[model samples]
Target: SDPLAEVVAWALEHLHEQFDVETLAARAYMSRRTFDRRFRSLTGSAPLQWLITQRVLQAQRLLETSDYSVDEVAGRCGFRSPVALRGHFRRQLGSSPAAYRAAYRARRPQG
Candidate 1:
């Protein structure tokens, strides 16, 4: 198996789990430094940052399409709580989850 691809696939499949860099290094059968370096070369971002971005993007989609509450989205997206989700969401998207959902709803076409 391609070790790096295996690790990335596992991470994407288990987004709700907390994965540290060291753990990912072990999973990839490389030293922390090597894993970080190669991962950046492959993905153009640090692994943790990539993971957080994945979580935030998933949260964004859920907020837009689902009836789940903010706290529910936080739990589903692997954030500790709504506060953590809000902080990262605001930083990356320049708005809160609620605001994002409102915009999506406003722009959605009616049948």
Candidate 2:
């Protein structure tokens, strides 16, 4: 894996914990500027923004396949609170987690 890939892989495993760009940079053995620059060049977003998107995506996956409540998913997704998860979840998907889950359930039948 590449530098950014390794860091992102590490991040996915540790995303539930609190961390910052500095920690990510440290793991990649790069400086703040270098890491941010490289991450942005490849991902087209800042590291923190990308991380937030990843969390929201993870929440969506859990909502689709698991029975976890929104609040529980928020905790597992590393959001500070359910409100934080709801805010980002809506901004990205244009609906609340509950609404998205309901809509998703409506579309997919259990086998």
Candidate 3:
């Protein structure tokens, strides 16, 4: 395909779902290697990494607005384990889930 908007849209919409790199490639009618290469070439990030970042950003938004526990947030955001989510949050964003939520809540305007 010459343009990548369709694939990018599909990826953004379903990044939290039960999908995999190969599965997305199949949906896009491209081989796995080509999908990864061309997606990165077009979007400037690896497909899987972009998906993970999207999921993590969703988790961050949820963490900011809801009282859900870490496990609940993890599950809702497509992470199978709280530990895995924590690792990702820490490595990618430099904050613990609780700390991040606390900061966000602290910044909320008092009613």
Candidate 4:
């Protein structure tokens, strides 16, 4: 059986777009159940969860480097709202977006 290397590549490249298990399954040319099983088998997580993880990582980079607002970061990261972004960020990273950005800025040397 093949791993989800191709799908994983696609997910990384398309992180700015919303994704669903059905969309990914169709893109991978497999049934939804088959895709789910294979994705979890290879990635140790569900396909959507993997996608969300990538989005969160991207959001972290943007927060640390860019001047975009929380709402802007949420939109760019394919989240529907700042609330959703904050919820996921807090759940996964143990800090809200504003707090994380504040810590990052504080740690960086002044210009």
Clashing pairs in 3: none
Question: What is the per-residue lDDT of model 4 for residues 1-111, given as tens digits with 9 covering 90 to 100?
Answer: 443588788888888888777998988889999999988988899987887787898899899888999899999998878899998999899899989999888888451
- The segments of candidate 2 whose C-alpha lies over 4 angstroms from its true place after superposition are none
Report how far off residue 39 is in candidate 3 (Å): 0.5
Off by over 4 Å in 4: 1-3
lDDT of 1 by residue, 14-110 (tens): 8887767799999999999999999999988999899889899989889877889988999999887789899999999999999888888889844
Q: Candidate 2, residues 1-111: lDDT per residue as tens digits? A: 597789988888888887988999999989999999999998889999999999999999999989999999999999989999999999999999999999889888561
Q: Which candidate leads the pack in lDDT?
A: 2
User: What is the C-alpha RMSD, rounded to one decimal, of candidate 2?
Assistant: 1.5
What is the Cα-based TM-score of model 1? 0.91
Residue 32 CA error for candidate 3 (Å)? 1.0
lDDT of 3 by residue, 1-111 (tens): 543567678766765666778877887789889888888988789987887787789789889778899889988888768898898888798999988888777887441
Error of 4 at 8 (Å): 1.1
What local lDDT does model 4 show for residue 109?
A: 43
Please give each candidate's TM-score: 0.91, 0.91, 0.86, 0.91
lDDT of each: 0.89, 0.91, 0.80, 0.86
Alpha-carbon error at 8 in model 2, in Å? Answer: 1.4
